[PDB]
Each structure stands twice: as structure tokens, then as C-alpha cells.
Design a protein around this ligand. Structure first.
Ligand code: 35R
Length: 273
């Protein structure tokens, strides 16, 4: 599965900032629907950096994976454009953007039932991938996207969706993998080729730390080299100020790779609170 979209059917509107070796843009895809009616659609346009064109293989292996999947809490991928010289991904556009900047903007206005439901939606998608023995590899708060904000008056919850895996950590330089600590599991630092279903659970715990602290970045004050010793010393994550979900964060972030519980178990612990 690898749909192709013509460059003449994609318009580029506003930029949305840089990213992990990519550049983000809002745009419109003009497609022809039934009865001969053109059907414009707001889309997300993820352009790979031309300077890093060597990562085009994993850049497209990420799109081929998400185009095969249909889940409520997964960002849909419409296709791929070879728009001129650049390689571009076309995805479902979410209105409210990244979750990490949403937690930081409304840090004191986010109830704990809000964070609990968001964690349920994220754990739902991770259970779907685990059920279908699929590995994500880049589960972080910056990749989580909010399509609907909380509306207690209507009774509908907030709605989050996880984006594409992006560039796999197996092909990233050792310089860049150490700077991703503690999102990269400890076993992947000593051996980048140890990608596993258990590696996502570690990132799920690190992401649960982000939402529980309100957008704060763990180990941000530490440089790349001190992060490397953080793992060798077997240090655990300092519990956030709220200190609610911190008990579950420690279980998901266990240094033994096979001790990480399944997401069917995690879904139970979130409903038991
Ligand atoms: O895949 C990603 N994002 C998206 C996939 N589909 N749609 C998006 C996306 N959509 C975005 C939309 C905005 C617009 N603002 C959001 C909050 O403040 C008001 C408007 C900003 C960034 C956005 N990213 N990665 C994120 C950029 C690093």
C-alpha cells in the first residue's frame, strides 16, 4: 500500500514549523468525488528536509505502515507526493496541533480527568498496534495530536490521534539518539537494532510523564552526555509535581525489557482510577 497524489492536486497554504528532519505545511487536496464534483479537503503536508534526503527510505516506510492501518486514534495518511524534487507525505489535518504545546499553553486549566481520558485514547491505539504486532518507534507528546478539545457541556471528551512514526531510530546517528533520552529506551541506546514491541511501552511511560507534568520535557536541563549516564546508573524518572500517574510510569519504564506490561493491562489500570 502506497497511494500517490499528483502535485497538481496539492495547494500549500501556511507553514506550521519545522520538525524531526521535516517541515510542516497546511494545504488543500483537490479530489474529484462522485457525480463529477471536485471535493477539496484540508490536509497536512509533511516535506522531508532536502538536506536529509538520505533518510527517504525510512521516511516512506513510515507512510506505508500508517496507510495500511485504520484506527480511531491514528492519524490517517492520504498518500505520498513526489512533488518536484521533494518527498512529501499527505495526512489528515488536525486542528489543534501538537499535544505538548497544548499542555504547556493550558497547564493550570487541565483537569486530571482530562489527562486520564487522553491516556486512555493513546493506550487504545498502542493496544491496536500490539494486537497487530506492529512497532511505532516514536511515541512522544510532540507526535500526539488533538483534533477536539474538551467540552464538558456537550459531554464529549477531548480527542487525540497519534501521527506517523517518522524516521526510525535504527537509522539515526548516535549523536541524535542520545539527545532523545528518555524517549529512546535504554536497550536501544546500547544497540539501535533492538527495536521491539516493548520499546514503545517505555516511550508510553515517558509520554505519560509529559502529560502528567503539563508539557514539561523530562531531563531537559541535562545535556546529551549526562542523559547517557542516567541510563547506566539505572536512575528512575523523578515523579512529576502532580504525582498521580507516576506509579504506573515506573512500571512501563522498567529497565528489564520484558517486564513492561501489556496495554490491555494498562487500559485496566486507567479505568480502575
Ligand atoms: O504530524 C505532525 N502534525 C500534524 C499531523 N496532521 N496535522 C498536524 C498538525 N496540525 C497543526 C495545526 C496547527 C495550528 N495551530 C494549532 C494550535 O494553535 C492554533 C492552531 C499547528 C501545528 C499542526 N500540526 N507533527 C507535528 C508538527 C510536529
Amino acid at each position: 500500500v502506497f497511494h500517490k497524489i499528483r502535485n497538481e492536486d496539492l495547494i500549500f497554504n501556511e507553514s506550521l514549523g519545522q520538525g524531526t528532519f521535516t517541515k510542516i505545511f497546511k494545504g488543500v487536496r483537490r479530489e474529484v468525488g462522485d457525480y463529477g464534483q471536485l471535493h477539496e479537503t484540508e490536509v497536512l503536508l509533511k516535506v522531508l528536509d532536502k538536506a536529509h534526503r538520505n533518510y527517504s527510505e525510512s521516511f516512506f516506510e513510515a507512510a506505508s505502515m500508517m496507510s495500511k492501518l485504520s484506527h480511531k486514534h491514528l492519524v490517517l495518511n492520504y498518500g505520498v507526493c513526489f512533488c518536484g524534487d521533494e518527498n512529501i507525505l499527505v495526512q489528515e489535518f488536525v486542528k489543534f496541533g501538537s499535544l505538548d504545546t497544548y499542555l504547556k499553553k493550558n497547564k493550570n486549566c487541565i483537569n486530571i480527568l482530562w489527562k486520564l481520558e487522553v491516556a486512555k485514547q493513546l493506550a487504545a491505539a498502542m493496544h491496536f498496534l500490539e494486537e497487530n504486532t506492529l512497532i511505532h518507534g516514536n511515541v512522544c507528546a510532540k507526535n500526539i495530536l488533538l483534533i477536539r478539545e474538551e467540552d464538558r457541556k456537550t459531554g464529549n471528551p477531548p480527542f487525540i490521534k497519534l501521527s506517523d512514526p517518522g524516521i526510525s531510530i535504527t537509522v539515526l546517528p548516535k549523536d541524535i539518539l542520545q539527545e532523545r533520552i528518555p524517549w529512546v529506551p535504554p536497550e536501544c541506546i546500547e544497540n539501535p537494532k533492538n527495536l521491539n514491541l516493548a520499546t514503545d511501552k517505555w516511550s508510553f511511560g515517558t509520554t505519560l510523564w509529559e502529560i502528567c507534568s503539563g508539557g514539561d520535557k523530562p531531563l531537559s536541563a541535562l545535556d546529551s552526555q549526562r542523559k547517557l549516564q542516567f541510563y547506566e546508573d539505572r536512575h528512575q524518572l523523578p515523579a512529576p509535581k502532580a504525582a498521580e500517574l507516576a506509579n504506573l510510569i515506573n512500571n512501563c519504564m522498567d529497565y528489564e525489557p520484558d517486564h513492561r506490561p501489556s496495554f490491555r493491562a494498562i487500559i485496566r489500570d486507567l479505568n480502575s482510577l
